[PDB]
């Protein structure tokens, strides 16, 4: 049951936009809402509006009086001397709650005229006509006007609706909540050479009487929220999908072949999401818009998605096809379960984010294989076991503070840190995988189909929300639908992993009792760490003995420590028979390293990742080597690679080398075995016999049979030896001499890989392989032996580093004439120049990176150069570079770059709270408090980034370096 927090119900909204002026960056328009009051004596009506100048408001064609105030413009007063962050977080939460449409509130308060009170008490319709104007919007909407001359279509000027969650208040007045569903009528009067893309279906396109402008009329009969309404106006090249004909793809001019190749996969994503769920795609059209200077890499609205143009690749670009493919896939998953089925509160957001991430993981499983699914699930779980042990924990479904271990309030999406938002979505889809583990996948897809079917029977009624609230899901409704389809309720699992905000830590060690033939496990939990919680459920453990692989369920109550499980025979060591594996197959194992008295080959605690856990198991090194070689699970091979770094014995070198030589191993395991072999090789110097590690293996796999030092000409058509070939010198460059210097046998090998590179024969580009070669050249740089702080000049350069510097100069200059796909070699060469500057080789001068961080460059070059400037101002304690970065945060045209500068200055801070630095003035505290209070008031993501930066630099209490 859904009861509105608003005293009115909104039925229909007309959004008309005229006079989109690109020179002056200005729009004019009106908005006409059709509300039905649910309570008599409505009097004031409270709507949401930011940055719009409200000209006049007429209610039922009668002139009404409005008052506007935004408490989130300046959160605390300018003349308050408070400088602690808990004060700002409480004041910011109160300010966002005072404009919240999820309460009754709002920023624009319109007073109902007196003569309509007899029209409002007996509950009859009210039609509110606001007309507004955006004069020059800051972050309200995306504006991109290039400085080439010509007409606005000839220079490539486009508009996007930027922002996240409820950010539609930034460009027209609305009820900007996900719970106020209404039908829509959208008119946009644009230039005759431009096209206006928006939500709904385009019913017509009429000309103006001078035929210089045309009006696009859109209609949206599926009741969506105001927060799902978007807009993209530009000179877009239109491409109808040749497979599905209601899907149109819009790109920027001159990028039509890239659009043709890139969006050619999307029909398979549509077919997948419509056959695992049994509902068809709910909207009547689908539109993909590719734009410049995007807010996020992929945004999903109702019947529309806005991607950045940096996803567009051609047919000869690999290492970008899977990333763009999965961006399209998660936009479509959010089309199904973020835009059609919406949110009932700010709680129950974990339901939608979990269903979106879970069905996108099912797509990844079918498309890229289970191996890639398991690797992705493990990397998401490690991300969580790192973030939650780092700071507190992520609390899905809080109850309204519920989480007081973090420096922000979790009551609203616009007060969350961006890393918390990312980890929120990550934990939501892992908890949905856990619900699939308890209640099987076909019942899970039946739950999702029942939600979609209730929403689509709801979506066709005309009753103003008598039935339109069946399109809003809640937690209680989701659990009730689960209990309807399965008969089991998941309330212990919901109580543990949703309502409780923690992950578990397992420390395991075994001992084999030879007398009674049992395996005595010893599993203890660390439940006193700040991020942890105590697990009391069951726990699966998989033991591989000589007779095969056996699963055991252990009951781990609070007082439990020793778990005795039984062991089988050892009669497959009496005769040589094959040892049967986890799957149905069996292999020949070399049992010379195994103990004579124990049959068990390896043990895995929680193999299926059925809890949110971090396992620290103490096996013997031969058990880790057997688990690396003969396991049929990629996460166990990865964890054995990760655990073999502590055992540098030559049997582990043989194990990793046998993994590296082995095709029919998953390629991301071999790419990890490269770096593990490099670390082991560095640890057993003065024992290593022959050549450096992986060199003979590289010449055996990727070089000519007649010439060992000449590499084969590039043929990248295998896509697994391509990735292994481009990752093996990067790990090989981490080899170190006894003298702690990279050997001149590996550096010469990398330089010969660079010289003899011929790419005139493959059908694929070479930009990522050459960029990884520059990364391998940067990995070999050891710190220089400066004497008496000698100035680093050209004559006293290292003889090794002169070759590296010549190569990166040649590569960067050749990129200036023949550019790569996304300037990958510019990014790699800037990163390598920063590596050479971090050691004492090149003079520590930020002027090159400051010239590459200007506005007109590509955004990857810009963020690489700004990363180099952030690293410089951390190491050299530069005041003027920090003022340069803070000025670039305040006034840069691209808001993604501002968010990225705040993000990089949070990750690599110039000082922490423990450090005494010269940069801890009262002036810097006043600048960052002014940046939290004012200055970042237009983005909701810069303000949370400024809160994160103030927390990283000065902590939760009063800045110490202050009177």
């Amino acid at each position: 049951g859904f009861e509105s927090p608003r005293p009115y119900k909104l039925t229909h909204q007309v959004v008309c936009i005229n006079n989109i002026n690109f020179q002056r960056k200005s729009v004019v328009g009106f908005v006409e809402l059709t509300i039905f009051p649910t309570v008599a004596n409505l009097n004031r009506i409270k709507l949401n509006s930011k940055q719009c100048r409200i000209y006049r408001v007429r209610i039922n064609d009668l002139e009404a009086a409005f008052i506007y105030n935004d408490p989130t413009l300046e959160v605390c007063h300018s003349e308050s001397k408070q400088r602690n962050l808990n004060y700002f977080s409480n004041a910011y939460a109160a300010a966002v709650s005072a404009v919240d449409p999820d309460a009754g509130n709002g920023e624009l308060c319109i007073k109902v005229p007196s003569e309509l009170w007899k029209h409002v008490d007996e509950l009859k319709v009210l039609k509110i006509h606001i007309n507004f104007s955006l004069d020059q919007p800051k972050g309200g909407l995306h504006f991109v006007v290039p400085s080439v001359e010509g007409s606005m279509a000839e220079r490539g000027a486009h508009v996007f609706s930027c922002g996240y969650q409820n950010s539609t208040r930034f460009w027209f007045p609305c009820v900007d909540s996900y719970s106020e569903l209404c039908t829509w009528k959208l008119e946009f009067t644009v230039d005759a050479a431009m096209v206006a893309v928006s939500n709904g279906d385009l019913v017509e396109t009429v000309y103006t009487h001078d035929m210089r402008k045309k009006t696009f009329h859109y209609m949206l009969t599926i009741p969506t929220a105001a927060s799902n309404i978007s807009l993209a106006i530009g000179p877009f090249e239109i491409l109808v999908d040749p497979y599905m004909h209601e899907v149109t793809h819009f790109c920027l001019p001159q990028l039509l072949p890239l659009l043709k190749h890139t969006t050619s996969y999307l029909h398979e994503v549509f077919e997948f999401y419509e056959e695992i769920l049994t509902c068809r795609y709910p909207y009547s059209c689908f539109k993909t818009v590719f734009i410049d200077e995007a807010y996020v890499e992929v945004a999903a609205y109702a019947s529309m998605s806005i991607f950045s143009t940096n996803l567009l690749h051609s047919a000869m670009i690999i290492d970008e096809t899977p990333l763009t493919r999965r961006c399209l896939a998660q936009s479509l998953a959010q089309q199904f379960f973020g835009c059609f089925i919406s949110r009932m509160s700010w709680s129950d957001e974990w339901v939608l984010k979990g269903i979106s991430g879970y069905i996108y993981g099912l797509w990844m499983k079918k498309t890229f294989g289970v191996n890639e699914y398991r690797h992705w699930i493990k990397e998401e779980l490690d991300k969580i076991v790192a973030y939650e042990l780092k700071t507190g924990g992520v609390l899905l479904h809080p109850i309204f503070n519920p989480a007081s271990h973090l420096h922000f309030s979790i009551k609203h999406p616009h007060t969350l840190s961006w890393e918390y938002y990312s980890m929120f979505q990550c934990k939501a889809h892992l908890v949905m995988r856990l619900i699939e583990n308890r209640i099987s996948m076909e019942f899970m897809l039946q739950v999702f189909n029942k939600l979609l079917s209730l929403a689509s029977t709801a979506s066709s009624q005309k009753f103003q929300s008598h039935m339109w609230s069946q399109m809003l899901v809640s937690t209680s409704g989701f659990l009730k639908s689960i209990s309807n389809v399965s008969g089991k309720d998941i309330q212990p699992l919901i109580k543990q992993w949703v309502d409780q905000s923690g992950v578990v830590k397992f420390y395991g060690s075994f001992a084999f009792n030879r007398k009674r033939n049992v395996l005595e496990l010893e599993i203890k939990q660390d439940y006193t760490s700040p991020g942890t919680q105590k697990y009391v459920g069951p726990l699966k453990v998989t033991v591989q003995e000589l007779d095969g692989s056996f699963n055991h369920t252990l009951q781990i109550e609070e007082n439990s420590l020793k778990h005795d499980i039984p062991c089988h025979s050892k009669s497959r060591r009496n005769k040589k028979k094959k040892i049967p594996l986890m799957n149905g197959e069996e292999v020949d194992m070399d049992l010379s390293a195994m103990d004579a008295d124990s049959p068990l080959l390896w043990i895995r605690i929680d193999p299926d990742m059925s809890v949110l856990r971090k396992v620290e198991f103490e096996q013997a090194d031969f058990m880790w080597q057997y688990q690396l070689r003969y396991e049929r699970d990629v996460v166990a091979q990865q964890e054995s690679i990760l655990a073999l770094e502590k055992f540098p014995t030559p049997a582990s070198r043989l194990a990793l080398t046998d993994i590296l030589e082995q095709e029919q191993c998953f390629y991301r395991v071999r790419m990890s075995a490269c770096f593990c072999l490099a670390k082991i090789a560095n640890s057993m110097v003065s024992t290593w016999t022959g050549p450096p590690a992986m060199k003979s293996l590289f010449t055996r796999m990727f070089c000519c049979k007649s010439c060992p030092n000449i590499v084969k000409t590039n043929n990248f058509m295998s896509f697994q030896s391509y990735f292994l070939q481009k990752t093996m010198p990067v790990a090989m460059a981490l080899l170190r001499d006894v003298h702690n210097l990279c050997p001149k046998e590996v550096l010469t090998f990398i330089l010969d890989l660079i010289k003899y590179n011929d790419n005139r024969k493959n059908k694929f580009s070479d930009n990522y392989y050459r960029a990884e070669m520059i990364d391998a050249l940067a990995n070999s740089v050891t710190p220089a032996v400066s004497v008496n702080n000698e100035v680093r000049t050209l004559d006293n350069l290292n003889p090794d580093v002169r070759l590296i510097l010549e190569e990166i100069t040649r590569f960067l200059n050749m990129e200036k004439l023949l550019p790569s796909y996304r300037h990958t070699i510019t990014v790699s060469c800037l990163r390598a120049i920063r590596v050479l500057q971090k050691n004492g080789h090149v003079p520590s001068d930020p002027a090159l990176f400051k010239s590459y961080a200007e506005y007109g460059h590509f955004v990857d070059i810009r963020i690489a150069a700004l990363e180099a400037v952030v690293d410089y101002t951390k190491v050299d304690r530069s005041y003027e570079e920090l003022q340069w970065l803070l000025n670039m945060i305040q006034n840069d045209p691209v808001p993604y770059v501002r968010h990225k500068i705040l993000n990089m200055l949070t990750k690599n801070p110039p000082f922490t709270k423990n450090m005494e630095s010269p940069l801890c003035n009262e002036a810097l505290v006043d600048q960052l408090w002014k940046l939290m209070n004012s200055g970042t008031s237009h983005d909701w993501r810069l303000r949370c980034g400024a809160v994160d930066l103030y927390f990283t630099l000065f902590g939760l209490s009063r800045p110490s370096c202050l009177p």
């Binding site: 290039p146 400085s147 080439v148 220079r155 490539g156 920027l252 001159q254 990028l255 890239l258 410049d292 143009t309 940096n310 567009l312 051609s314 000869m316 050209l794 510097l805 010549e806 100069t809 960067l812 200059n813 200036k816 004439l817 023949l818 550019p819 796909y821 996304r822 300037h823 010239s851 590459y852 200007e854 506005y855 007109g856 460059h857 590509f858």
Partner: peptide, 25 residues
């Protein structure tokens, strides 16, 4: 200037055209 000369970085008016577009096709 004699040893390791770098061509100076010039800004483009439209940078996606020189970035994303293929030159040999």
């Amino acid at each position: 200037v004699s040893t390791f000369p770098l061509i100076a970085a010039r800004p483009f008016t439209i940078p996606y055209l020189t970035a994303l577009l293929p030159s040999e096709l």
